[PDB]
């Protein structure tokens, strides 16, 4: 924990160290790096085709062949992996959710589009049913139009055995179902993906900032399964229980509006650590900006928070542009 | 924590989340009106009222519209206001005189609001910027560096000012080593015996302060020092822990992190480690991004209260926050 | 920590190693140039290089020829610089008068540096054995045992003279009790406000000093004294974290732990208990030992950065290190 | 944790208990023994056989006989226990490893005679496939060159088994294949080897340190089974793994590059922690005691700091030396 | 400690027991000559040795011939002795002055061992009750009861006769408040910067003391006050660490707890929290019972070591025995 | 843990608490009672019988009928319970133990006598091989004269189950076999015995103070079970072990020589914790007292001590005496 050590003004002056450049850079505790960033993409059907976010200024839905442009640029300056997020044509949607392990779904396309151009590029895909169902909720429904935990754990299963097939080096089950990392992980076990790694959404919140994602993909009660805001302690349990499944990483998200949850999963577990900026928070910050209100420095800023704060990785739409100004 | 080998299928943690009932049942934090405090910019002159563009729906305002408007929120229950004078362009100096004058906007709005609404807390600014010609936190030596002893001797009068005028509580905001110590031993000394003292702490070398500087006319000033020789480097975490410890000792009665959300593990680790009275400021550049993304259609208008929500459960006491009138409303209902 | 209930097969930790981005992703550490903290050996006169023998590729350095190499370590962007004067033996005395001499070596290199390159941090060594001809690490009694108080007032005011020539570092190396407060209490009252005091606070009693006292001179005199009667017994760990207390509580800004890599688990326990800025020295006999081995073919030149990470990962925040220019050049790359 | 109690210059002088020898003494917090010394020798195929090793000064291959020998010294001067490296001719080296479990092995040979001759020595047999590989890798390849985990397993289990019937006190598994202690640990006990000791190398590191090593056995990706030495947090679930598949010791690998991870591990689990001082680590020591550089007392102080650190014993090419030193 | 999951069969703890040199290691501790301290009993006049019945095989001795034991002493390299003068009756007063006489035996036993075994250590005992008539712990005041602060005096004084006859530590035994600080206070004022202050620190009212106060006169003292108002009650367990913690804020070099076999939770606690140099004393009824068993045939010679390593199992760093000589002998061998 | 409060002299002066016995009391920490009291007895094979211990001054072996007489005084006292320990007749030793679980053993008969006659006071029966052996060792002997763990297990199992037959409320197993009070704990599920409790022997020490029990029940390589003096940390493994296991209550044996590892245990578990004035503790104390050389309150100081380190419940040959004063 921690020992004040008697320290005690004038003996003892914080801003000394605070007083010229060298010695700040010195005793700085945490750094960015580039290692420290993946980007979301999102992804379209076709060929030649990008489309604009109207809620998510400067991102971009890209085909797969546009996709596979701007990964060069990704990989030059060195981010480690993308999180690809398919915009799913509304014909291909139905109420069992059979897209999400079709072979030929925009994910399984997109992964083994990119495993072959770009083999060193991690792959991060979506596991989760709500870009696959009609009424666009987390799961397979009852009649009472509530989201069935195990029915909607067996098509996840299908659809990440989908993904480790296409080359996937990592997959990531966003749908708050119980107990899914564990059948994730013994389907992936003895279809014999021995290093096919599961990063597990946690500790994800009943969240307002998942907004403008909503338009990003087309899909705009979620409280009987994603994480009530008020609840830190319940975070603990979320994220014993996914790695005693067999995770290889944990994520929080949210992200800086829960960079407490951050800080105890990363001091209470030792475990790798991720946090997803999200959508909101990416507009958020974009909107201040353009409007002149905010310095483009709160970029920066906004990540290098996550470090402090414990995380080993972050998710961020800011990516490119953060990549770019770490190195220039 | 021990996990106590809790395993699916027997722990299913969607139990407690499927009615409405047994998730407030497990609720593991409320906020409620208790919790705010309200900043205000503040103008000289009478029927003075002007909107602020980077930071959409706040006023600055004269005297007499405080005391309109604070009607309302005594009405809605918000336990304290936090004032920011607006200091005319011909008050500033090198030697921030004005921070001590019985007749600046600070003093003159505390006693209006001491006589008007005696249960509403005042917390009044204690800082040398907003009356300094270059603008920068304190006193300059001939290197152009913020002097931190020199300062302080300033700040202890602009502090006893404050304390003559009514205020329950002063905030010493200009990072100085050794600042609260000082403040503290010359309330004490002069019989200001239960003055609050309301440390800004672990305050950062922030970019979210933007907006802020707009209110109060010093965003054309931010080049002519370097805030980093006494606001902390945003990287340090560890770093906080020992300039809350310092405050503690040296007899704060409430410590405070600022930024808020972009800082909510240090407000975790502030409160986990000394269990006093925590407080944490949502600063202009966190309002300024909930409006400018809201008014545009992009965020609903319930992340006001998630934001709000977010550093109850991170550990904190008390939140300064430009949304408090609104919060405060909604609450309320 | 708890372990979660993590069992293979469900848990694999080779699936994180399978490939590189991964590896990447989840790396605890990493090394920068802001970590490092380059020593240098210091000659009187001009136009003077000299090579160490027992420590390959290393250079003595008049002023002048400081200069020249301080052009490539500030564009490496290296931070700070500690220097060790390499004294001439007619200016070794009883008294170590030399010690505070505005003309000494590290006075004069200190305000040449200083001026040539304003933002190069400067680390001076308060210390007497460079300045008495019995080589112990201050003044002795009449029992040749090294007495503590009388020793401090001469580092005092030799920690006096590096702040009047410009040192925004002086860096207390000699073990005795007490100095870092008496050194801080001088520096406060002679308005040296700002000077940073990085103390030698966890330095033992060590073998792999060898070389250095080859760089400086100094072998012939080991055998004069009892180093053990102020050093550190290795054995000794929770010794240790008395010593950094005593330290932080005296005002340093910076704690240290010396040697560095064979007393990793002093760094992680300091840096642990303490959460304060933490500097380990990659001494002289570590720096021969890699270089020997590389020389000779033994071992990859991919150990410099090993050894160096290891430091980041058992909690240091800067290390004193004699590879501070190639790993500067590797990382760089 | 630690409480400084107000201790304050000049009420305390922590040089008042270095004053005098016999203070120094009765607080000195750790001291080394021969008790804490483990010796690696490397064991040659041949009768009357001695090799130099350019790498390594001062250390020889032996033929078993003439292990058999220097084995009488080093059970007088009270060395516990020796680690066994075979030395494998290139002739016995295959795909399968299949050299591994031959009970007429290297391994096998000197552990039957060092049993029956000093019945009270400590063997420590090595469990790894790299001495028995054609391609010197750690284990069974696939065709893309990847280490296979289980596959690999499956042949440390017979080998661990042959040692077990050779009379090896100890198994000590090398190679960093996830579940290993595991699998050798069910194959000891359903055997009824219940007493047969495994040492798990649990913290083993891609290290730059093994250099003088690989050739002493004649062998000069690892990243992908062993340590980034960037990480520790990582050693905890590593030790905590192999403690629960049932190691009797865990090992830290390099040693005083690692000694805060030393220090974690024996905090974190108090249970019998070892260290291994590797080739890299003794040239280094004597390439710089050779050259006059350093004072051979640099050989005890290293071995202090694995005590001080936490270790119970110590892995050392350093072990007669000390040894000696500490006798005399 | 976390458990780590292990379970038979995977994990049998029997494993490592099975072998002589497995069990050597995992063997967690072991005691060595470096862990021994002799108390010694020293009478007045030439040529005397007088049995101890209550200590089988222990002798008061004469100056001389505790000079001529002493060479067996240092040759088996035991550390330190702690001096217990056996006071003439003629020479104990109302005010203790033979505490502090230069002339007394724990003064010329110390300058006679000093001079002639100068590496060994000499530990002082600085108490009055040798000294008093009445055989309590320090000056009584008209009520009976020992007078805390007046006792100090007059333990100061003798500390200092300890310091000046060249004891390198004194060990103040008798339990008075503020002790350790107005002795150390004492010693820096007076030049005596490294005299080690041994404190009896967790000292308990015990039945165990009953032979030592055979071996010094003062068993039918016993009724004539109440030493429960100064030494600890035998039920309390967090009273210690308070006790502990004040000594070592008060200047201690080393802590102790006494009795030792039965108070071994205490040295641990001891130990566990403020990791400092701990001692323990294995007393005169310890070693009587161990004795009187050995002597009836009851015990093996074995449980000495069994009793001594305990100690260094619980965390003592060092272990005042009567039994130094003969656990040295087998070490040893 | 702790933490001083800046507590410091003259302000703070521990001996004002200590100046009355009024506050004295107040304040004391820890208390003594009968409660914690339990009486280890020697039982003969005859009736009307008992013998004199000459290493244990002032205990006596009895037949069940003396037992009985005794008994009425203990029971009247309070003292909670009884630990038999049976002087078994060498005829009935023999290598394979059976006399371990015979129905008509003295353990057995003693049992139902005192359940019978007592409802109320608590049996604790010892499971243990070495009363049964003839080679008095504590199990079943292999070739080379070792104790076998698992098939010495077997009969333990069947001595615990003729014990819960005979009524014994508490089996406590004494011999440090691994696993074995997980296999009596199956055994006393699967026959329906879920009230019987179970006092582990968990923390017990290859010790010299053994020595007069030897003599009182007539048996004058432990290192291979019993634990090494000089370990701490391993005590804390075999507890967890022994609680994961089912144990009601777990031991540490010798006691005063122990205290730390009382102190440790009870700390960590926070379970019911038992320790053993062993034989060796009782017979130094008894022969200082008769000699003269310690008052006889050493007794109640050396009991005191238990509770104040950590143990609910002491197993010790003075608990009359120490009933006695405690009520007188
Ligand atoms: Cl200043
Ligand atoms: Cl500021
Ligand atoms: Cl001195
Ligand atoms: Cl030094
Ligand atoms: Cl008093
Ligand atoms: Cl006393
Ligand atoms: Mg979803
Ligand atoms: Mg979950
Ligand atoms: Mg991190
Ligand atoms: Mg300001
Ligand atoms: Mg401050
Ligand atoms: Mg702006
Ligand atoms: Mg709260
Ligand atoms: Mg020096
Ligand atoms: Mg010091
Ligand atoms: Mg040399
Ligand atoms: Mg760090
Ligand atoms: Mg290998
Ligand atoms: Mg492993
Ligand atoms: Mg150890
Ligand atoms: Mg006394
Ligand atoms: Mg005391
Ligand atoms: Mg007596
Ligand atoms: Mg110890
Ligand atoms: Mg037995
Ligand atoms: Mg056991
Ligand atoms: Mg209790
Ligand atoms: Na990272
Ligand atoms: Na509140
Ligand atoms: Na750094
Ligand atoms: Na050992
Ligand atoms: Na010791
Ligand atoms: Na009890």
């Given at each position: 924990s921690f020992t004040p050590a008697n320290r005690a003004y004038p003996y003892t002056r914080l801003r000394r160290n605070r007083r010229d450049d060298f010695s700040r850079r010195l005793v700085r505790e945490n750094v960015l790096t580039v290692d420290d960033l993946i980007l979301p993409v999102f992804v379209l059907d076709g060929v030649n085709q990008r489309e604009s976010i109207p809620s998510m200024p400067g991102v971009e839905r890209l085909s797969i062949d546009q996709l596979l442009i701007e990964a060069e640029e990704w990989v030059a300056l060195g981010i480690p992996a993308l999180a690809l997020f398919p915009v799913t044509p509304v014909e291909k949607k139905s109420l069992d959710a059979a897209e999400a392990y079709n072979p030929e779904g925009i994910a399984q396309r997109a992964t083994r589009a990119l495993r072959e151009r770009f083999p060193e590029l991690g792959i991060i895909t979506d596991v989760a049913l709500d870009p696959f169902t009609t009424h666009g909720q987390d799961g397979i429904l009852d009649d009472d139009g509530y989201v069935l935990n195990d029915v909607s754990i067996d098509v996840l299963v299908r659809q990440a055995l989908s993904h480790a097939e296409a080359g996937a080096q990592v997959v990531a089950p966003s749908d708050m179902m119980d107990g899914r990392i564990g059948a994730i992980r013994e389907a992936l076990e003895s279809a014999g993906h021995t290093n096919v790694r599961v990063m597990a959404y946690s500790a994800k919140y009943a969240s307002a900032y998942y907004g403008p994602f909503r338009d990003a993909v087309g899909s705009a009660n979620?409280?009987?399964?994603?994480?009530?805001?008020?609840?830190?302690?319940?975070?603990?349990?979320?994220?014993?229980?996914?790695?005693?499944?067999?995770?290889?990483?944990?994520?929080?998200?949210?992200?800086?509006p829960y960079l407490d949850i951050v800080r105890r999963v990363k001091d209470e577990f030792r475990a790798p650590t991720f946090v997803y900026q999200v959508s909101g928070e990416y507009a958020m910050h974009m909107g201040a900006i353009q409007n002149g209100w905010l310095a483009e420095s709160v970029i920066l800023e906004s990540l290098t928070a996550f470090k402090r704060a414990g995380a080993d990785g972050i998710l961020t739409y800011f990516a490119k542009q953060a990549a770019e100004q770490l190195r220039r």
């Open positions: 979620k409280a009987t399964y994603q994480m009530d805001p008020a609840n830190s302690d319940e975070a603990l349990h979320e994220v014993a229980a996914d790695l005693a499944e067999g995770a290889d990483m944990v994520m929080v998200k949210p992200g800086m």
